Design a protein around this ligand. Structure first.
Ligand SMILES: [Ca+2]
Ligand SMILES: [Ca+2]
Ligand SMILES: [Cl-]
Ligand SMILES: [Cl-]
Ligand SMILES: [Cl-]
Ligand SMILES: [Cl-]
Lengths: 662, 662
């Protein structure tokens, strides 16, 4: 209901409501176009996550998943940071992360008229370039002489009725500072996933580095900690039910302007196929041995705008709705095939991201120095392919067999990827085809890969079954996109017309746009809920809950001996709740989605109160229409984070830098 | 902690505490030795259950399980009362139940000195007759000229330190008045068993009949409704958290005076074997395809009495404790074999209660009229054997195989029942032995039994495999009892000595005796609890909870169309809670156990507020030491009972008789 993800510019038209909920911040304290504000502290981590700066030395807080790749890359047999955690006791002990990028919003500019004028310049348009962030960002040099360490991001808002430009400081020297052990960072990661109550210490600590002047730069020996314009201060006094909660971050995608028919499609195609493919997964895992509906809500909002379009002489609103419905039915087959490919293969079967040999392998194999460069690319691709964070569940060969068999049944042979339809044809079934791949591929195992990398050959790399699988699957993805574009372009144009009417009716200052992975703020209150009859969920969880879930045999519920020793002695310090319990997590009515992972949660005074890392609902259903009655965002208590650093890790250096207030 | 099951005579020494909890009743209103009180309204149903009289025409309320046998006996294909429920719209439509007995306490008398003097009369005693209720009840005619329709019950209290006599009016014309459908009477009977929250309408309605003068009698055409001295009035104003709750009934067995070593034995033998055998059951069901410990608490109480025995010159207390421990270890093997036979075969394998041919079958088969009499006994035994209420779960042949196989592994051949050790020896395994029985037995199926009963033969009945099984299993039971008696008698004597010391220390007026299936009262408050971190259970459940658990495919969760129609229209009447929700169940901190099934739950003013039908904990662990912090008794809301009669059934006759106050 009230889950708006507001633009930073809309702080003025929201500040009144927020102060009545208990906020003591001023509008300029949250966003200031002429000074420092909380904007300069909320960063984009690795492009898909969110982080917060908490010191004058550029200390960065985020989730455990967002920094997983970095923790994994730095992990070994002797020093398993992924399992045991990592704690640097000095600036020099902080681990360098090649490739890792963190962006800070320097300033935001309205370029609506500029972008629109640039779109008219196109001779014969595809019809989707007015929404493509890649195309829109290329129009930036003509608008702004582009400095280094700066990126100019331009994206569509309100379905293409507005265009805002984001000037980004791009830091390319982001180093790993700290990380909790896996038993804490993802306690009950499988069972309690997308679920409240929760008892997970989901965090990881990084730091921004720059030159002597504080400007973004590549890794250098001489680089020093970045000193931000503004960092969020950490509060350790605690939280209470009913408290105001401010969340800033980069929400990925929402669908708040969905026509009733768009909800039907999402339910019948997008959502059903997601649940169907996910069901096969937990079936493969299972062969272990020892009052108002969504469509009704969006239909009411649809009719509300249509009744406003009528009564006023506007016909376009009503033309847009039917134009949308027309495109929906037209792409029914295309959308269905895209979703099965996306839910069944691209996600679910890791083989889709198998390494591909570059031109240096096929060509120039005889050039020794160039050969090793191509082999290095292969090795690099394999490490970023083999075992990701949360996604490896069970036996990969059996999982791929079950998913591909279902895919082959849902999609006819002539509409399958070439590798799949040819493989099934030659080996008989989708099972036998997968079996062959895991039988012959280099990348089927680490020991297989390393055994091959000790005497490589060009042929073998070029004709690898798993590589051909990933390429042909990707090729189909892009064939579908080009073909469904004949329906998506009329859909997009009609959507722009429909949102334009909603904009005319409700006014832009009072209408939050859909999330598009740009900086936004949202607010609510710390509050529990009633999941079912007789049962009430509180807003806060404690360390006692961790001990209740302790199962020495269930690896997701393993409790570290040190953590258990702290619980027995009640050695919590000033981090504990007033009632003497040690806080772990809390939930809030604030709307967050994919991309808000690692978002700072702040006080009524704008002090860091926790880190967002999950929500109690899964699927995108809550992004179509938020339901604050039961839908919550699950947040790591910042006192628990401090507790892990202090009483568990013994890394006093980080406490002294953070300086938690009380 | 405070789960005393007080004698009716102890009402004086408890009334003060109860009134401070909010009770407005006087002591004489609960128990009066010279007048009518709530005592005369709380009846013993079928010997093992409890019932309450709620009208001047002898209307009786109890659970759905307590009257199951009656509902089943009266059920047929055309009129399935077990599934669809039963509702009599007049006195003449009430169904006669042969054999059903209901006892009312006429008066209670202290006969301690009399019984003890009678025990000294025994020449050479076994050592257990001072606890045997059968023996003690035979001493009654010498104490009291015994009228008809009266039974004199004498039992041991405080381990044989007190003896109280109960004069019982025995009604043998108890007729079935009403019963809810199975979908209501046992909604979620499997999953929500021994569990809170709960949404079960567990009840059944009977009525006492008597002669023209109101005296107990066998069934007769001329019998009229019994008019009790005192009946409990039904209150429909509702309940609130914190309200005083009085429960009267007949609790079966508790073990509050257990020595620390007695707790160890119970845990290692009694409880472990119960859980072990129960585990095999849910394993057979699973091959469906598509801060202080108990011993520590009782040790503290043990030492508390021992420290009191010392300091005072008493040595017997300390002699008793070691005497108990001596008997415990002595019967270790005997107790273990008794428990495996009890948990593995007597309960779990229904074959243990297979029909046995009487002397009229073996002898006098040539006498035609006597032959049919024996066949009638066989038929009677089969109906009371074949499919009980809550116990038939799944395939019986596979269940017996799994349990007997485990039994055979735990108990060596020479210590097994003769039928089992000889069957296993001839057929090879416990599986093949069970297979033979279900292959050849008459009683293996209803259709098998009826097919046999159309042309019976003497041999076949006499040598039936299932009959021989039940007899030899029973024979072993009685061989074990006679043999373990050499340890149980010194144990009993030592227990009597130990409780005697506790009696001397705490005083009888302030000490509640262990339950022995006699009339007792207990009290507490209506109150929820915290099962785990972040989760809170309320004290009351609503009809909304039923609809949330609705699963048309899960038979235990089938919701009747009529009940669902009532929920949609909110047709609750004055039965609904103040907030507009329809109450179903509530829980209280009152200690109840097996035998309290159907016990009346009453107001602070002694008005019927609900019926007890379960508790949120299983096993006997709470009967050794009650833990009111989380242990609750689960109670049917009386307003829900009235609602089922009125708005669901349409049996207005019962409402007009009950006359619910407000
Ligand atoms: Ca607090
Ligand atoms: Ca009420
Ligand atoms: Cl293509
Ligand atoms: Cl705690
Ligand atoms: Cl015997
Ligand atoms: Cl309700």
């Amino acid at each position: 209901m009230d889950g708006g993800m507001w633009l930073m510019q809309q702080i003025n038209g929201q500040v009144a409501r927020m102060k009545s909920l208990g906020m003591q911040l001023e509008a300029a304290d949250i966003y200031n176009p002429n000074g420092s504000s909380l904007k300069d502290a909320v960063v984009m981590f690795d492009g898909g996550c969110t982080g917060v700066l908490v010191s004058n030395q550029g200390l960065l807080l985020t989730n455990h998943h967002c920094g997983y790749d970095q923790i994994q890359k730095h992990s070994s047999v002797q020093h398993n940071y992924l399992k045991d955690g990592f704690w640097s006791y000095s600036l020099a002990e902080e681990l360098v992360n090649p490739g890792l990028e963190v962006e800070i919003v320097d300033e935001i500019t309205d370029v609506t008229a500029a972008v629109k004028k640039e779109l008219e310049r196109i001779k014969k348009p595809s019809g989707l370039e007015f929404l493509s962030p890649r195309y829109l960002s290329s129009l930036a040099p003509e608008i702004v002489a582009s400095r280094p360490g700066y990126r100019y991001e331009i994206k569509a808002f309100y379905g293409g009725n507005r265009y805002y430009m984001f000037t980004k400081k791009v830091f390319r020297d982001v180093r790993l500072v700290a990380a909790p052990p896996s038993s804490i960072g993802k306690f009950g990661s499988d069972t309690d996933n997308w679920a409240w109550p929760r008892h997970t210490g989901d965090f990881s600590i990084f730091r921004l580095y720059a030159d002597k002047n504080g400007n973004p730069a590549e890794y250098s020996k001489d680089n020093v900690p970045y000193r931000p314009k503004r960092w969020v201060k950490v509060n350790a006094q605690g939280v209470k039910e009913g408290d105001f909660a401010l969340i800033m971050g980069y929400p990925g995608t929402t669908y708040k302007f969905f026509t009733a028919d768009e909800v039907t499609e999402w339910s019948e195609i997008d959502n059903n196929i997601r649940i169907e493919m996910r069901g096969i997964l937990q079936d493969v895992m299972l062969r272990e041995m020892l009052r108002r509906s969504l469509r009704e809500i969006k239909l009411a909002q649809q009719q509300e705008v249509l009744a406003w379009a009528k009564q006023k002489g506007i016909a376009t609103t009503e033309e847009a709705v039917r134009a949308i419905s027309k495109a929906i039915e037209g792409r029914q087959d295309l959308r269905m095939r895209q979703r099965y490919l996306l839910e069944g293969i691209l996600m679910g079967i890791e083989m889709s991201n198998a390494p591909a040999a570059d031109s240096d392998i096929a060509d120039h194999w005889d050039d020794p120095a160039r050969r090793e460069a191509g082999l290095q690319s292969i090795r690099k691709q394999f490490e970023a392919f083999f075992n990701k964070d949360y996604s490896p569940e069970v036996e990969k060969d059996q999982l791929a067999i079950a998913l591909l068999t279902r895919y082959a049944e849902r999609i006819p042979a002539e509409k399958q990827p070439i590798s799949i339809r040819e493989g099934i044809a030659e080996y008989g079934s989708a099972k036998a085809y997968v079996e062959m791949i895991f039988d012959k591929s280099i990348y089927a195992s680490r020991e297989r890969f390393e055994e091959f990398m000790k005497n490589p050959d060009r042929d073998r790399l070029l004709r690898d079954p798993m590589s051909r699988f990933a390429a042909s699957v990707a090729y189909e993805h892009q064939k579908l996109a080009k073909e469904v574009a004949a329906f998506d372009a009329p859909l997009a144009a009609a959507q722009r017309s429909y949102v334009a009417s909603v904009l005319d009716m409700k006014g832009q200052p009072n209408l939050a746009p859909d999330a598009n992975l740009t900086l936004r703020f949202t607010y609510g209150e710390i509050k529990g809920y009633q999941p079912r009859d007789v049962v009430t969920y509180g807003a806060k969880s404690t360390l006692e809950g961790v001990m209740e879930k302790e199962d020495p045999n269930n690896w997701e519920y393993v409790v570290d001996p040190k953590l258990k020793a702290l619980y027995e002695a009640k050695n919590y310090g000033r981090y504990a709740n007033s009632d003497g319990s040690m806080p772990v997590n809390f939930c809030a009515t604030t709307h967050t989605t994919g991309g808000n992972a690692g978002s700072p949660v702040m006080n009524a005074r704008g002090e860091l109160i926790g880190l967002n890392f999950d929500r109690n609902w899964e699927g995108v259903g809550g992004d179509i229409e938020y339901l604050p009655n039961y839908q919550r965002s699950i947040i790591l208590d910042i006192r628990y984070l401090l507790f892990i650093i202090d009483k568990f890790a013994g890394c006093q250096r980080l406490i002294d830098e953070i300086q938690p207030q009380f």
